[PDB]
Design a protein around this ligand. Structure first.
Ligand SMILES: N#Cc1cccc(-c2c[nH]c3ncnc(N4CCOCC4)c23)c1
Ligand SMILES: [Cl-]
Length: 259
């Protein structure tokens, strides 16, 4: 199959909705990614056209072709961060730190334009040929700030092991601390190659253990004291006591020179 000048050469994977194909232009040989959706997406395109940052997947544009919408996007030839995390091990701390810096640069950018991603996790964090991180998939994204006025969110969405506890507990909540939380679970996954809990609920034993500071258990025992002190500031149950991005950027481990 093919779309105007582009051939659909192969399946890269599935986003939150629909299929993503590698599109190669037959003329120019340029390779991009195309998300193919059958038959909400006005909002998504609208958010996609806002995006201009080196740690965010770039939107090239779209074509309706009968039933099928085709959303053209930057290709990331390095695959996902998911594939760089070795189970039970993680990755080298300097690599983790570098990816964390890039993730924060992307999140700050989004938040600065009033967008929350709402599903940060390693599958949505892609790597270009130089291992630069790009935040992908704006199908759950939404505006939380417009004309300088913040709106609280109420929709439950995301992925349970990554989702902040207020989203399970509060009728309405601030957007930014939710995305911060999920960045903390990504950090843990990078440093330990395991997720700390199935969900951050009072009924989840591993979540209770963390609240009781049992860091002699896994995954925490695999993580050095400096990044762990950051994770103690991020994975804070009360979102108004949770560290903000400005303060993450002052954290000791964040600023530690590494290999
Ligand atoms: N909407 C959206 C969305 C969600 C997730 C990823 C992509 C995606 C954009 N550029 C890519 N480059 C290389 N692989 C990619 N993926 C696609 C999905 O499977 C993983 C590998 C992408 C887009
Ligand atoms: Cl993992």
């Amino acid at each position: 199959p093919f779309v105007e000048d582009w051939d659909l050469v192969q399946t890269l994977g599935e986003g939150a909705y629909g299929e993503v194909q590698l599109a190669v232009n037959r003329v120019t040989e340029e390779a991009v990614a195309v998300k193919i959706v059958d038959m909400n997406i006005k909002k998504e395109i609208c958010i996609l056209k806002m995006l201009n940052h080196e740690n965010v997947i770039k939107f090239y544009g779209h074509r309706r072709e009968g039933n099928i919408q085709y959303l053209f996007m930057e290709l990331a030839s390095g695959g996902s961060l998911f594939d760089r995390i070795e189970p039970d091990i993680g990755m080298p701390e300097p690599d983790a730190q570098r990816f964390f810096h890039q993730l924060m640069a992307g999140v700050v950018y989004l938040h600065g334009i009033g967008i929350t991603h709402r599903d940060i996790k390693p599958h949505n964090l892609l790597l270009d040929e130089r291992d630069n991180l790009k935040i992908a998939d704006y199908s759950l994204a939404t505006v939380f700030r417009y004309n300088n006025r913040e709106r609280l969110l109420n929709k439950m969405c995301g992925t349970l092991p990554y989702v902040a506890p207020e989203l399970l507990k509060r009728r309405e909540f601030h957007a930014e601390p939710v995305d911060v939380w999920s960045c903390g679970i990504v950090l843990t996954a990078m440093l330990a190659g395991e997720l700390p809990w199935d969900q951050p609920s009072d009924s989840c034993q591993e979540y209770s253990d963390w609240k009781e500071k049992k860091t002699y258990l896994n995954p925490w025992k695999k993580i050095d004291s400096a990044p762990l002190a950051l994770l103690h500031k991020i994975l804070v149950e009360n979102p108004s006591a949770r560290i903000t991005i400005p303060d993450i950027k002052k954290d000791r481990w964040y600023n530690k020179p590494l290999k």
